[PDB]
Structures are given as C-alpha cells and as structure tokens.
Design a protein around this ligand. Structure first.
Ligand code: HEM
Ligand SMILES: CC1(C)[C@@H]2CC[C@@]1(C)C(=O)C2
Length: 405
C-alpha cells in the first residue's frame, strides 16, 4: 500500500521502505534497515509506505535534524501521522523551552541518584533470576529473563502491582510494534484508563513511588495538573516496559553465537563498560521522528510544512562514515559513535538506569553461565517498529558447565 507521491517530491528521491515490515528482516532487523545506507540510496529519501514520509539515512543528517527543533518539531513524533497526532506524552511531544521544565521533573524519578539507590535491588533480582534458571539447562530468554528483569524493577520503582504486567505490556507493544489488533489512539486510551485512577489516589495519599512523585511535582513554579502527570507517567510506562527488554535479547542472541566475545568479557572484566557501549551501537533499536514546522530546504531537498521525517536513531552508529566496519562487533573500538539514546534536547533520561541493567546482566550471567548457545533448529525472528525486538530466544546449555555463585 503506497500513498500517491506528493507534488514536491522528486521521483529519483523515492525509496519505498516500510519501517514496520522491512524487506531483509530475515537477515536481522539492523541489517534490514542498513539497506538504506547502500551506495544506490540518497542521503535523504521519501517512502510511499505508511502514508508517505521522508527518511534521513546518514548520521550527520540525523544529528542535525535532532538539534534543530525550530524546523523539526517533536509535536508529531510517530509515523503514521494518525499515531503521531494521537501522541501526547510529556516531555517527548514538546519542544524547548517548554520541554525543559517537565524534563527536570522526569529526571527526578529516573535520573542517576535513583539508579544509585536501586543498585542493590537490580543486582539482587538479576542474580536471583539467573540462579533459578542455571540448573535447567534451557530457557526462552525473552520471557524468562529479558522481560521480567527490567519490568519488575520498573514496577518496583513505580509502585505498581506485578499482576498488571501482562495487560500493560500488551498495550505498550501495540504502540511501538503495531499488531493491527488496535489503533494507537485506542492503545493510548486504555493505558490512560489504567493510570487515571492511580494518579488520583497518589495525589491524595502520596507515597515515595515515581508516580506519587510525578503526580505531586511542581512545574514552572506551579503544581502539575492531573492531565500533565498522566501524560508523563504514560511515557515512563512505555520506556520502562519496552526498551531495555528488547535490547537485552539482541545482545544475548549475539553473545550466544560468539564464544570469543563471551570469553573476552570473562577474562577481561574491565572491558564490560566498553563492550556495553559497542553493543548499544551495533544493536541500536529505536526509530522515531519529527514534523516540519514550515517549508525548509534541507541539504538541497525541499521539505514542506507538515511533512513528517523519520530520523532513525538506530542508523547513526551503523553509518560507515561514522564507524568503520559497522556490522562488525569490536569491543576495543577506539571510538564508539552512536545516537542510540537519542540526540538533542530529548536525550534519553533513563539511559543511566538502562546501562546499569545491561552491565549487571552481562556480568552476572557470564559469571554463572559462561557457555550457552541458541537451541538447535530454532529460528530467531526480529520485529521492526518504533522500537525493534526479538520474538523469542530459545537458549540451551550444559548445567555441568555452570557455576553456582
Ligand atoms: C536501552 C533502552 C533505551 C533506549 C535505546 C532509549 C532510547 C530513547 C530515545 C532514542 C529517546 C529520544 C526520543 C526522541 O528524541 O524522540 C528517549 C527518550 C526518553 N527515554 Fe529512553 N531509552 C531507553 C530506555 C529508557 C528507560 C528505561 C526509561 C525509563 C522509563 C526511558 C525514559 C526516557 C524518557 C523520560 C525520555 C524522554 C526525554 C525527553 O523527551 O526529554 N528510556 N529514549
Ligand atoms: C522512542 C521511545 C523509545 C522514547 C521512550 C519510549 C519511546 C517509545 C517514546 O515514545 C519516546
């Protein structure tokens, strides 16, 4: 389903890429998106899929656009337009200077100091989950670890019941990797139907949880409104439930296929942080965008007001002009360049929490289960969207080779 080409788009700039179903998906999602960086593809293209929109394919252009909020607004960040229009999360749907005040409050609940305080809990949960899995000699990583580990930590931070995970996770996924079962607007309404009663309660009887903090926070000198708190908590929910969850699976899938990389981290632990950065570059998984606030000539191409442009955060680090041999994983890269956590005024506030969860996982898993691989005959399938992911990851290992710690 290709939308008719708009009058202002030159035919030679057309490249019909479908971000929800790219062609080479079987080869891996990152590989599928990397076709946009082939020599035959211009730096800025227009796709007729998903309603029609531009796509910047180079790190330089992606960074530039994310810095210039004057022309590229966060008001409509999701594609298709219907989704971008229904999108109202704070502070991501706001441009500076308005965004700043809300960003400050959100930093209060997921910023560095909160991570420092939750450190021991993150460590305890990781160890507890792995030790319970260790003797079994097999598991579906996505559902046995990738999902429970980060999600339970978030539910703990937000003060929400574990029983609600299945429901909340389903809604979140519909927003990033649309099933077709429901529209973004409907998925958003349901999520808000869930939060409203809770925020109402936390406003009267405040706790120490993230939601209580947001609900009773202050912005621009005055108290936050119920609606504003709702829209911010909505964003925190999606970030906590559908980001680290998918990244862990991409990383573990790679480690399961590369004994040499596992060994490297086991023998030289001081390399884990650097390894984490390189994995974040190679397995980058986010791609959202901006909307043109007016007509603007960008690198020779004429963009029209209202035009939507996808600026794939995942593509910056795969760009060869930024990283030599981009598809190759090299823990000793002198320079790891990427925009996995974003760029510009909307730089990810939860990146400290994410890095902590990734590093703890790598260390604690390789400590107890140094040797593992993908189950024979299993075919790992990736899924594309605003946030990419892995369908399932069956792993197997010899319990005799594990170490109880
Ligand atoms: C590895 C996982 C993660 C990745 C790759 C990631 C990526 C991103 C990206 C690319 C943005 C910018 C979006 C844009 O500019 O339109 C962003 C924003 C944000 N992320 Fe993360 N994120 C991750 C984990 C988290 C977590 C765990 C949370 C916490 C619940 C979270 C909270 C936020 C917030 C609050 C923003 C909005 C900041 C603002 O608009 O000022 N993220 N993230
Ligand atoms: C693009 C994101 C990864 C970022 C945090 C959750 C997300 C889906 C948003 O809507 C903003």
């Amino acid at each position: 389903n290709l939308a008719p080409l708009p009058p202002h788009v030159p035919e030679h700039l057309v490249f019909d890429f479908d971000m929800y179903n790219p062609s080479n998906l079987s080869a891996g999602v990152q590989e599928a998106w990397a076709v946009l960086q082939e020599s035959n593809v211009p730096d800025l293209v227009w796709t007729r899929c998903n309603g029609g929109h531009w796509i910047a394919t180079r790190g330089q252009l992606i960074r530039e656009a994310y810095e210039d909020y004057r022309h590229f607004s966060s008001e409509c960040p999701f594609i298709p337009r219907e989704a971008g229009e229904a999108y109202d999360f704070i502070p991501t749907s706001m441009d500076p200077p308005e965004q700043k005040q809300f960003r400050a409050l959100a930093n209060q609940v997921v910023g560095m100091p909160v991570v420092d305080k939750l450190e021991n809990r993150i460590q305890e949960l990781a160890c507890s989950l792995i030790e319970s899995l260790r003797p079994q000699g097999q598991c579906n990583f996505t559902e046995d670890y990738a999902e429970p580990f980060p999600i339970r930590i978030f539910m703990l931070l937000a003060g929400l019941p574990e029983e609600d995970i299945p429901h909340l996770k389903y809604l979140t996924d519909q927003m990033t990797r649309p099933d077709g079962s429901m529209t973004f607007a409907e998925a958003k309404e349901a999520l808000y139907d869930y939060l409203i009663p809770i925020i109402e309660q936390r406003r009267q009887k405040p706790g120490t949880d993230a939601i209580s903090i947001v609900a009773n926070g202050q912005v621009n000198g005055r108290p936050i409104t119920s609606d504003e708190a709702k829209r911010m908590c909505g964003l925190l929910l999606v970030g906590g439930l559908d980001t680290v969850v998918n990244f862990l699976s991409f990383s573990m899938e790679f480690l399961a296929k590369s004994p040499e990389h596992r060994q490297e981290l086991i023998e030289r632990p001081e390399r884990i942080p650097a390894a984490c950065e390189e994995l974040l570059r190679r397995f980058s998984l986010v791609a959202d965008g901006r909307i043109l606030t007016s007509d603007y000539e960008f690198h020779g191409v004429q963009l029209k007001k209202g035009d939507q442009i996808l600026l794939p955060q995942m593509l910056s680090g795969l760009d060869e002009r930024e990283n030599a041999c981009p598809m190759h994983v090299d823990f000793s890269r002198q320079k790891v360049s990427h925009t996995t956590f974003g760029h510009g005024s909307h730089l990810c506030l939860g990146q400290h929490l994410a890095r902590r969860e990734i590093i703890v996982t790598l260390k604690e898993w390789l400590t107890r289960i140094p040797d593992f691989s993908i189950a024979p005959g299993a075919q790992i399938q990736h899924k594309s969207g605003i946030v990419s992911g892995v369908q399932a990851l069956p792993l197997v290992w010899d319990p005799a080779t594990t170490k109880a710690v």
